[PDB]
Design a protein around this ligand. Sequence first.
Ligand SMILES: Cc1cc2nc3c(=O)[nH]c(=O)nc-3n(C[C@H](O)[C@H](O)[C@H](O)COP(=O)(O)OP(=O)(O)OC[C@H]3O[C@@H](n4cnc5c(N)ncnc54)[C@H](O)[C@@H]3O)c2cc1C
Ligand SMILES: Cc1cc2nc3c(=O)[nH]c(=O)nc-3n(C[C@H](O)[C@H](O)[C@H](O)COP(=O)(O)OP(=O)(O)OC[C@H]3O[C@@H](n4cnc5c(N)ncnc54)[C@H](O)[C@@H]3O)c2cc1C
Ligand SMILES: CC(C)(COP(=O)(O)OP(=O)(O)OC[C@H]1O[C@@H](n2cnc3c(N)ncnc32)[C@H](O)[C@@H]1OP(=O)(O)O)[C@@H](O)C(=O)NCCC(=O)NCCS
Ligand SMILES: CC(C)(COP(=O)(O)OP(=O)(O)OC[C@H]1O[C@@H](n2cnc3c(N)ncnc32)[C@H](O)[C@@H]1OP(=O)(O)O)[C@@H](O)C(=O)NCCC(=O)NCCS
Ligand SMILES: NC(=O)c1ccc[n+]([C@@H]2O[C@H](COP(=O)([O-])OP(=O)(O)OC[C@H]3O[C@@H](n4cnc5c(N)ncnc54)[C@H](O)[C@@H]3O)[C@@H](O)[C@H]2O)c1
Ligand SMILES: NC(=O)c1ccc[n+]([C@@H]2O[C@H](COP(=O)([O-])OP(=O)(O)OC[C@H]3O[C@@H](n4cnc5c(N)ncnc54)[C@H](O)[C@@H]3O)[C@@H](O)[C@H]2O)c1
Lengths: 444, 444
Amino acid sequence: MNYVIIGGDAAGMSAAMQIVRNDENANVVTLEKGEIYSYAQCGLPYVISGAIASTEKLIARNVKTFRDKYGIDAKVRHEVTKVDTEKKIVYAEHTKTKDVFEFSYDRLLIATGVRPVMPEWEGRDLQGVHLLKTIPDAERILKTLETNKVEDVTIIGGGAIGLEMAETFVELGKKVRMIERNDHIGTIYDGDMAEYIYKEADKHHIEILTNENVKAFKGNERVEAVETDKGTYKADLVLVSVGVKPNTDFLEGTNIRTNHKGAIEVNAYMQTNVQDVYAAGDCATHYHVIKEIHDHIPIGTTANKQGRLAGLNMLDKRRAFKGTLGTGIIKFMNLTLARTGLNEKEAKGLHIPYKTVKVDSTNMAGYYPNAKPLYLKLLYRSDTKQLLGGQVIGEEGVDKRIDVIAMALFNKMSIHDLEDVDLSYAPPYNSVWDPIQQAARRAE
Amino acid sequence: MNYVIIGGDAAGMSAAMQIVRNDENANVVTLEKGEIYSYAQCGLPYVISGAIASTEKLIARNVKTFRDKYGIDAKVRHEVTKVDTEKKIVYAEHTKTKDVFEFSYDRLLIATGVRPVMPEWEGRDLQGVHLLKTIPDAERILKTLETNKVEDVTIIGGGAIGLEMAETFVELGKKVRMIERNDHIGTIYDGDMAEYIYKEADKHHIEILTNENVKAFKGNERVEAVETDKGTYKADLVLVSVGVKPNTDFLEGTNIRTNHKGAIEVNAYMQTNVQDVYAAGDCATHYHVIKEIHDHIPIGTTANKQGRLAGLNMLDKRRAFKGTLGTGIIKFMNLTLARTGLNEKEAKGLHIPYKTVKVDSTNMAGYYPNAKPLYLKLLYRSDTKQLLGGQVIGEEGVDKRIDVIAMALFNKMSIHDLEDVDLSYAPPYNSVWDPIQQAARRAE
Ligand SMILES: Cc1cc2nc3c(=O)[nH]c(=O)nc-3n(C[C@H](O)[C@H](O)[C@H](O)COP(=O)(O)OP(=O)(O)OC[C@H]3O[C@@H](n4cnc5c(N)ncnc54)[C@H](O)[C@@H]3O)c2cc1C
Ligand SMILES: Cc1cc2nc3c(=O)[nH]c(=O)nc-3n(C[C@H](O)[C@H](O)[C@H](O)COP(=O)(O)OP(=O)(O)OC[C@H]3O[C@@H](n4cnc5c(N)ncnc54)[C@H](O)[C@@H]3O)c2cc1C
Ligand SMILES: CC(C)(COP(=O)(O)OP(=O)(O)OC[C@H]1O[C@@H](n2cnc3c(N)ncnc32)[C@H](O)[C@@H]1OP(=O)(O)O)[C@@H](O)C(=O)NCCC(=O)NCCS
Ligand SMILES: CC(C)(COP(=O)(O)OP(=O)(O)OC[C@H]1O[C@@H](n2cnc3c(N)ncnc32)[C@H](O)[C@@H]1OP(=O)(O)O)[C@@H](O)C(=O)NCCC(=O)NCCS
Ligand SMILES: NC(=O)c1ccc[n+]([C@@H]2O[C@H](COP(=O)([O-])OP(=O)(O)OC[C@H]3O[C@@H](n4cnc5c(N)ncnc54)[C@H](O)[C@@H]3O)[C@@H](O)[C@H]2O)c1
Ligand SMILES: NC(=O)c1ccc[n+]([C@@H]2O[C@H](COP(=O)([O-])OP(=O)(O)OC[C@H]3O[C@@H](n4cnc5c(N)ncnc54)[C@H](O)[C@@H]3O)[C@@H](O)[C@H]2O)c1
């Protein structure tokens, strides 16, 4: 009967849809801190570039639909500040009036996602210093682009948001610099594959500063410079994209177990250790198919999967989450960057004995016009030969190959079994042996 | 030590390479009727269109390479006319001098592939009436185009070659007509998916004549008209594109078992019923993963796989062929046409209880620019839900989806298991749920 969901996006609303469809007697209350439900965070960098007309295009399902069509009591501007899991009561503040509302539950779902991290640097609050998470976040970047003379842009963090936004700011015709604490950008990539990223950014005149630590943002009313341990550089707009943190702060005091980064531990059924409390999405842990422990790889695909499952499991339609593979894909200028399963640092960290194969080949028949380079790397166990991970980088046909590799990892295939799959071939799409199959043959 | 291989292309030479690499003592004789080894039949339609410079670009490995680098005794213009399996002797006739040569073997592989069928119509032999199989075939088609004023082109048979060449002739700026014996072109496609094919052809002004039967080709020294049961049409060049027959004729009188089509029956290890005789490629049968029966789906991916395997098995490096899935992919004008596993006709013929799901979707996030329609159909067992087959049609992202479906079929996945795979998502590549997963959700 009484279902409460905290967070009105991918994981939360996937759960809501499941409950609503499979229980007519259910009273669904969803509590969202912001004013916007079910939107596509993935489209943000492409709204900022101007490729998409507006942020309005990123709304998947508006609140009126949730209320009128599905009978969900979708609350906006309700921030949850406390949960009493014993009395089964959720306490929410109104973000404007600051008045306090309570919501009784039979089953609770926490789907509060993650927020971007802003390190405690001087000048972090200066105008023109931006994090990117939400539609308003994007609009505030658009405001800085609209109302100011922006020519130099500095990005802190050479990960997923930093890479895509480097494209966006290049496309908007800015002089882009990226500052990365670690040894290379695309840190989820092995050293040898990361080289391809550095070449592409270099080619488009993106200054990459590696092993460099930001100390302060300098400026008056606005940012005008970024100070590091190695120098001070003019900046008209600073994007901070240095990772994220689970929105699980408000749970301190509930006995709900979290891992070291604050992600809520869930079992196969999206259940926490506390009775009738569930979690899903970026705020939760993600059982890893290959690592065989609970990881934290916050991503939209996983969030919808976990959200859907949490909903079903809350209805007692028992269904286990099979896990993440750590898949990820990024468009970066002319390159597509794809990975899945284990990279070399993950395999090493786990003390799993592995070997690698790397093939430089083409996306399609070498004789065909506009066949393009494809760089493909695979990891596999030394003993059993079980496929462990893949990294694919190139201009075209990269998403295809990572999806096939993901399929192989999901099914725990040996690397040599790939040789046997009847994958498709015609000249405009592949070679008579797919690059994955050629790599598999090179394997021991 | 004495290995004899009949056929110098994909299946035959894949076998040759395995033997050569894994037995330094071996005497390999390969017997090829034509003059060209290891070439890409797949690139022929794209040579004729002018997209590829010449047929030279289609040679993967030279006979000179085979002889000098690998020490294979590669024979050209050697047509095998009979085999004595008791004496272990192969009889080859030189195609020019007509001289007969004997070759004794310890182990024999037959890799003679298939040949295009020319029905016994009047006018068969008129200049400008062409089959397409070989590089000389391609050259003859170009010879007609160079020396003859070609305006109207008529293609007989609306299968794989008819489809690709219909594009090739359109691109060369010709008026193209297609005449098909049964109800629709792309007969391997279900009626409902085939609609998309005749919409694309129509769009490009390709006349499709269905349930219509060629009666004769009319003309002087050269072809000038095609005659059917329904009319007579101007044609300056006729491509006959009506299917293929195994080149196994010369084995009559041996006890080597063939299926009804004349394809040579092989066990897991590419062995025929006759001691020390092996077969591989288009001339042999193809165990079907889903049908669980020996099929005949002649294709180059399978040919190379079977060839490689025959070579290994001939060396007593025992390895079973896992089967075909009947995967096929075609570029047709602006469409990519892909299928794998069972269609409805195949499932019905086998009396496997099945159901279907069809999704009209996009290749990538619906809000992203130039996201294109994607039409996707899946068949699955009504009882176990085992995935049985897929058909995918659209302008982009089709090869990706069919490869993923192929992976699912190879691993005998249930249709709903697809929902659980961590497939890649970013906006330029996919939607947060892949079309395959959305189809899977609709399934019972
Ligand atoms: C720029 C960008 C690009 C991305 N691109 C991709 C991509 O290409 N592919 C991909 O798979 N993923 C991508 N992602 C990630 C993906 O968008 C997220 O993984 C997904 O949104 C997670 O869903 P969720 O429901 O767990 O969390 P969110 O979507 O973050 O939803 C959590 C919601 O909970 C609310 N909330 C938080 N705390 C409270 C509280 N105390 N009380 C009430 N409500 C609260 C928040 O307001 C928020 O709306 C991208 C993210 C960004 C920022
Ligand atoms: C136009 C066209 C496009 C194609 N496109 C694709 C595609 O996109 N993707 C794909 O996977 N496949 C494609 N194929 C099919 C693919 O090329 C074949 O399946 C593959 O070549 C089969 O290899 P094979 O070694 O079994 O037979 P073949 O390649 O046909 O080789 C057999 C050889 O044996 C020789 N031979 C025959 N009889 C004798 C004899 N009596 N004595 C001595 N030698 C003999 C022949 O001369 C021939 O060279 C295409 C085919 C054509 C015609
Ligand atoms: C060209 C042809 C002889 C290829 O033979 P092949 O054995 O598949 O390929 P190669 O001879 O190049 O060797 C591949 C082997 O070398 C190894 N290898 C290749 N490159 C390597 C490298 N750079 N470093 C180390 N090893 C390598 C691979 O691991 C593979 O080993 P395996 O055969 O034990 O699995 C054969 O495909 C053919 O005749 N084709 C006709 C053209 C065709 O394919 N037509 C059909 C089109 S539809
Ligand atoms: C929009 C959102 C609510 C979608 O919820 P959803 O349940 O996945 O999708 P729908 O509500 O459309 O329902 C789909 C269900 O209806 C069924 N269905 C869909 N179309 C159908 C049709 N035409 N006929 C019959 N059944 C249909 C499906 O089989 C599916 O069934 P299941 O839920 O039992 O598997 C959710 O994804 C969301 O809020 N997302 C936020 C945006 C986002 O995804 N962000 C992250 C991007 S990185
Ligand atoms: N298409 C995609 O997969 C995609 C795209 C964009 C965003 N996202 C989502 O957003 C989340 C967060 O993105 P993100 O880029 O903020 O995190 P991230 O983990 O992708 O990138 C963080 C980067 O910042 C670096 N860093 C940390 N501290 C730093 C410092 N002090 N100075 C300089 N660099 C520092 C890290 O080394 C790392 O390279 C991802 O986990 C993902 O869920 C996904
Ligand atoms: N990309 C690819 O997969 C691809 C492309 C080209 C060729 N090929 C290979 O070539 C082989 C044969 O190609 P194909 O196109 O010759 O055969 P096919 O089976 O693909 O097409 C034959 C077509 O001819 C029709 N037909 C038969 N008799 C007819 C008649 N009397 N009048 C009119 N139509 C008639 C059939 O109904 C069928 O539609 C395929 O099996 C495949 O191995 C594959």
